[PDB]
């Protein structure tokens, strides 16, 4: 007897309430619900209307600047699950600056399959620090509760008692409360999400959130898997086909949809893999009659023609339209603003594209760790470049460290150049490897790739200093290395030893007390060369140390600056530019003296 | 009876000693003395020869890698003054890595008119910390005693006693000693440099260093001013003419020199202003007969044709060849390596050039504070540019703050662009003023002038925050300002107040404890707007404070980032990028929401 209602399309509700209660006869919404700006409503016409028949929303629910909305307790009293088929800027439940919302009161909300929550800028909102956000969301890293009244004043929340279980999330039982008259059902964890009928009884796997009987896929409010004829079922049995991730429809439904969109005006709703997919995927075509996407001879690739040849990617909502196509007829300006590692969603959506007929621009995308998103990118053309005729733009991606893995990834950049200036944690070795593998057709000129202000956050001196002698007895640590000399021995200022008191085995690169040691004597003979080393003062018995040494050298513009760094080994137990300027002055005068004194035969 | 000898040209002495004692008959040297590399000499053939007739050297004295030179006590026992007409890399006395030099022993050396000393890399040199360097050099800022034996071991110097006056240079009498058998004559300071004959007796102004009699310009070893017929005299009386800054010659001498160089092969030695100048200056020409540079009709400018159209300037020796000419037929790559402000010499030599038919490149010239050197530069052509077609290159001039004063300086850069990337202490306002005044003919493209990594060392927010209310009684400091709002009020993170305990009235820009204050409320009405201010905690009575406030805002690429900074006023008495990223994320989501919700008529 589940879902006693029709199936509602996505809705925009602006201005007044008549459409909001056009939502009376609605047990499920196939689109998005947007209760948008309403100004002439006051907290007295929000009491009579109520919609207890709404069970789930397929895409998301957005509420933005509606006055008089005291609570959602009566508006959505039976909202069980909000799926994440289509998001709104990688958020499945957005609550913006709308005011007069004293409490959330979604006591029947139990899970959100995909997405996050961005309740923010609510000036009069309480009962927010006790909401679960642990049993409703399984991906809690983008939750963005910031600017509500709970962070400005003290509300002094109460909660129904005698008596509703608090749970430990930081180390103490506080509350898991929804409102002044309701709490949220938490049930034994032996079942992840199968339904619990007010006692300890996990229902069948084919039930999501809530159930009313013992194991009975046909008796529960929502289906985790596909829904068919009043029963929650696995992959649709024949002759039923999948539809929009939650229904099992019959062939006639897709026929009617195709006939309606083929002439009236549309997401043709073709059948590929027992799913009534809007469009045939890459490598398949629609012929006639039976709705099937047969494989095409002379491989046919799916293209995503851009609006005007340019696209900015900032969330998963914008990246979801670039799904299923392998050729991009435009350019990508991916720009991930924020402090979250949006990698899985971009890989799933923006991963099948192989040809970009434009420029791959990377703007100020913070928290972007790698470019493995385009794991099938083999060709970046250059038909439509940018100003300066660059084909690969790369602004200050602060957390960018490693580009495409050049051991198993191809590339054929054609008719364009590169642009790598201000990426802090990147290193020039990766850029040069990209140059060698891709074979750039533009041969970028000077200062296109910044030589020095492009790797000064991670040590990639691309050389190793093997330790030779270690002897630690009670208080002295003795070090001996293999001496290293750059092509010009006068550029080596010395070695900068690092050591830190740490008995723990997970130590990374740069607390970290620094010492300076003078370079050895250039004996120019196969002698000991003094094996620079150092003898640190200060030690207590039975401790572990972490040490790694970096070489300090002068900068050379017309060369990749040399360097060396030993691996971080562990001992078991027992005025920075003035010196560079002075060394450069010494070198300059010595070179001038040699040039003046030493001249060839007149 | 002064100068009982001939006049020696400049000399190079390599290999062996026969030319060194070709210097027997020599009371003055008109050029440079270079005792260069000698290898087959040992410390036993340096005893018999001595040159007590050498009184002064006109240009400089260079000693480089000669072995067995135990001391200069016998080699140059009468060297009184070394002038600075022509230097060797802005040094008038160079002593390089030559070894076996136990002591300097130039006890008769008393003054160096122009230049410095660079005694360095002497592995066995003592008696160096007691040399005057206060009465010999009047320009002690480039002296470069660094790598001698006195800084590696302890020599334990002795000094002739009973008895030779030490003088205070750091706060204590130590020594002013020359060697184990000689000290240096210091005499009363009532006369700067006029000669003192072993007692308190300042000789005539026309005597330099040493004199033997009472005031008698005709009786002293050296002349401060010009020398004429055995007497030290002022500007040469007629019919005598100046010659090489130290002689008074007669007309026949310049006739003979001109006749010798006009046919045999040469610094034509023409007469302009009673000086036998090698070449006529700008605006004058040589006609015939009488050696005179009459003014030329149809103004004739003097040009300095470069060797191959390119020149690197690194000291005063290289800049001295560009003296007296107004048009440069090449390019300048001025590159001042070091920590000294070489400004007066460059202004005197490299100051009359008006047209540079090339590119003005500025390489890694540290300690360069301004570009007022070319005070007569009105035209930088573009006939011969560099790679990238730049006409004004500017690399990381760390101490560059202020370019040509654009209130009284012209410029006509033609056929070229600009290049301002990594000048730390420079500011974008000066570059844009240069653009407005010069009127660049190239219209440089994007990223030619770095927008952001070009002013992050000096506060030039080009705005003022006038203080409104100040009230300090015993412990509280209250501040009220006029509120400042950028074009987008969401970019203002707040104000960063600075205060430092300082009862002294000379306080400059950025110890300096930092506090953060939240921005006020955007009332959008002519209200108080909360007048942000702050109330610092901690104060003791009867002290002075220095305070100045800077505004923290997000960076905007397609705009000169706004800002404000109050003037440094004095009170009389009584995780930095994560926040920026979060603010940018807030702005990005709000903009996306406004764009999606607000659409025009379909």
């Amino acid at each position: 007897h589940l879902y006693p209602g029709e199936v509602c399309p996505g809705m925009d509700i602006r201005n007044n309430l008549t459409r909001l209660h056009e939502l009376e006869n609605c047990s499920v919404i196939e689109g998005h619900l947007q209760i948008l700006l309403m100004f002439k409503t006051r907290p007295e016409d929000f009491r009579d209307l109520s919609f207890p028949k709404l069970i789930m929303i397929t895409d998301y629910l957005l509420l933005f600047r509606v006055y008089g909305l005291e609570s959602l307790k009566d508006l959505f009293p039976n909202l069980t699950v909000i799926r994440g088929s289509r998001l709104f800027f990688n958020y499945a439940l957005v609550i913006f600056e709308m005011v007069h919302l004293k409490e959330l009161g979604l006591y029947n909300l139990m899970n959100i399959t995909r997405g996050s929550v961005r309740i923010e800028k609510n000036n009069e909102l309480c009962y927010l620090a006790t909401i679960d956000w642990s049993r409703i969301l399984d991906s809690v890293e983008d939750n963005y509760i910031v600017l509500n009244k709970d962070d400005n004043e003290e509300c002094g929340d109460i909660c129904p008692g005698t008596n509703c279980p608090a749970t430990v999330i930081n180390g103490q039982f506080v509350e898991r409360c929804w409102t002044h008259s309701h709490c949220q059902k938490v049930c034994p964890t032996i079942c992840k999400s199968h339904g619990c009928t007010a006692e300890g009884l996990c229902c069948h796997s084919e039930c999501l959130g809530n159930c009313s009987q013992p194991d009975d896929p046909t008796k529960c409010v929502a289906c985790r898997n596909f829904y068919l004829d009043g029963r929650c079922v696995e992959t649709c049995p024949p002759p039923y086909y999948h539809f929009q991730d939650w229904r099992c429809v019959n062939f006639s439904f897709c026929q009617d949809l195709h006939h309606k969109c083929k002439n009236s005006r549309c997401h043709q709703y073709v059948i590929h893999n027992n799913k009534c997919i809007p469009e045939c995927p890459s490598g398949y075509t629609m012929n006639s009659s039976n709705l099937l996407c047969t494989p095409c001879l002379g491989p046919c690739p799916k293209v995503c023609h851009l609006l005007e040849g340019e696209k900015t990617i900032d969330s998963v909502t914008s990246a979801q339209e670039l799904r299923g196509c392998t050729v991009i007829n435009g350019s990508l300006i991916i720009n991930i603003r924020g402090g979250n590692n949006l990698a899985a969603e971009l890989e799933a959506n923006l991963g099948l594209i192989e040809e970009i007929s434009g420029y791959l621009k990377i703007r100020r995308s913070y928290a972007l760790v790698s470019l493995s998103f385009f794991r099938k990118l083999r060709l970046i053309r250059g038909e439509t470049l940018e100003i300066g005729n660059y084909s690969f733009y790369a602004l200050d991606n602060q957390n960018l460290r490693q580009l495409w893995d050049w051991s198993k990834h191809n590339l054929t950049i054609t008719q364009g150049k590169l642009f790598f200036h201000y990426n802090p944690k990147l290193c020039l070795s990766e850029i040069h490897k990209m140059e060698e593998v891709s074979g750039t057709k533009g041969r970028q000129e000077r200062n296109d790739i910044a030589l020095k202000t492009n790797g000064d956050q991670a040590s990639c001196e691309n050389e190793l200093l093997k330790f030779s002698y270690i002897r630690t007895s009670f208080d002295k640590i003795l070090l001996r290395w293999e001496p290293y000399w750059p092509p010009d021995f006068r550029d080596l200022l010395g070695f900068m030893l690092f050591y830190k008191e740490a008995p723990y085995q997970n130590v990374t690169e740069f607390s970290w007390t620094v010492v300076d040691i003078d370079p050895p004597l250039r004996s120019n003979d196969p002698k000991s060369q003094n094996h620079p080393g150092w003898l640190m003062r200060g030690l207590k018995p039975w401790t572990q140390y972490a040490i790694f040494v970096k070489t300090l050298v002068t900068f050379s513009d017309e060369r990749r600056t040399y360097g060396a760094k030993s691996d971080i080994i562990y001992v078991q137990t027992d005025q920075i530019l003035k010196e560079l300027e002075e060394s450069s002055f010494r070198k300059t005068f010595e070179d001038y003296l040699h040039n003046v004194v030493f001249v060839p035969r007149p | 009876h002064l100068y009982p000898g001939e006049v020696c040209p400049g000399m190079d002495i390599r290999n062996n000693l026969t030319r060194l004692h070709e210097l027997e008959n020599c009371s003055v040297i008109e050029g440079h003395l270079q005792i260069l590399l000698m290898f087959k000499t040992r410390p036993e053939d340096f005893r018999d020869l001595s040159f007590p007739k050498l009184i002064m050297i006109t240009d400089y004295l260079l000693l480089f890698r000669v072995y067995g030179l135990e001391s200069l006590k016998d080699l140059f026992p009468n060297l009184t003054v070394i002038r600075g007409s022509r230097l060797f890399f802005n040094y008038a006395l160079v002593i390089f890595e030559m070894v076996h030099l136990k002591e300097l022993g130039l006890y008769n050396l008393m003054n160096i008119t122009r230049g410095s000393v660079r005694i360095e890399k002497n592995n066995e040199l003592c008696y160096l910390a007691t040399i005057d360097w206060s009465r010999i050099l009047d320009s002690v800022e480039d002296n470069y005693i660094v790598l001698n034996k006195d800084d590696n071991e302890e020599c334990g110097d002795i000094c002739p006693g009973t008895n030779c006056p030490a003088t205070v240079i750091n706060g204590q009498f130590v020594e002013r000693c020359w060697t184990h058998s000689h000290c240096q004559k210091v005499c009363p300071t009532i006369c700067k440099s006029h000669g003192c004959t072993a007692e308190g007796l300042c000789c005539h102004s026309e005597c330099l260093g040493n004199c033997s009699q009472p005031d008698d310009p005709t009786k002293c070893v050296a002349c401060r001013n010009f020398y004429l017929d055995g007497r030290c005299v002022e500007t040469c009386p007629p019919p005598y003419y100046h010659f090489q800054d130290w002689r008074c010659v007669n007309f026949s001498f310049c006739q003979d020199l001109h006749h010798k160089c006009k046919n045999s092969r040469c610094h034509q030695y023409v007469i302009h202003n009673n000086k036998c100048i090698p070449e006529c200056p700008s605006g004058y020409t040589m006609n015939s007969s009488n050696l005179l540079c009459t003014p030329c009709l149809g103004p004739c400018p003097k040009v300095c044709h470069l060797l191959e159209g390119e020149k690197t300037i690194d000291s005063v020796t290289s800049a001295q060849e560009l003296r007296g000419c107004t048009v440069i037929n090449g390019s300048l790559i001025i590159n001042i390596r070091g920590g000294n402000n070489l400004a007066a010499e460059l202004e005197a030599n490299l100051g009359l050039i008006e047209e540079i038919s090339g590119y003005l490149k500025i390489r890694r010239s540290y300690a360069l504070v301004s570009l007022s050197f070319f005070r007569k530069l009105r035209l930088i052509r573009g006939e011969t540019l560099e790679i990238g077609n730049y006409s004004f290159y500017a690399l990381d001039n760390q101490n560059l703050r202020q370019l040509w004063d654009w209130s009284k300086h012209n410029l006509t850069i033609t056929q070229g662009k600009l290049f301002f990337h990594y000048n730390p202490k420079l500011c974008l306002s000066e570059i844009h003023k240069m653009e407005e005044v010069s009127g660049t003919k190239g219209r440089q493209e994007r990223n030619d002038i770095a927008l952001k990594t070009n002013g992050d060392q000096a506060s030039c927010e080009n705005e003022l925050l006038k203080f409104s209310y100040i009230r300090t009684s015993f412990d509280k400091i209250l501040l009220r300002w006029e509120p400042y709002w950028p074009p987008d009020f969401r970019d203002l993170l707040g104000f960063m107040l600075f205060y430092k305990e300082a009862p002294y009235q000379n306080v400059t820009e950025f110890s300096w404890t930092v506090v953060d204050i939240d921005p006020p409320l955007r009332s959008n009405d002519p209200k108080s707007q909360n007048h942000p201010g702050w109330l610092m905690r901690g104060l003791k009575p009867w002290t002075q404070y220095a305070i100045f406030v800077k505004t923290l805002v997000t960076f905007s690429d397609e705009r000169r980032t706004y800002g404000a900074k109050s003037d440094i006023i004095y009170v009389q008495t009584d995780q930095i990028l994560k926040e920026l990223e979060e603010s940018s994320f807030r702005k990005t989501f709000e903009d996306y929401l406004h764009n999606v919700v607000f659409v025009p008529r379909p």
């Binding site: 092509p487 010009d488 006068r490 250039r522 040699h594 030493f598 | 290898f39």
Partner: peptide, 18 residues
């Protein structure tokens, strides 16, 4: 065969020139 430079040029030329 290596980049001599510095104090090594002035004591490498000596051997070559002798």
């Amino acid at each position: 065969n290596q980049h001599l430079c510095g104090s090594e040029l002035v004591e490498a030329l000596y051997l070559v020139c002798l």
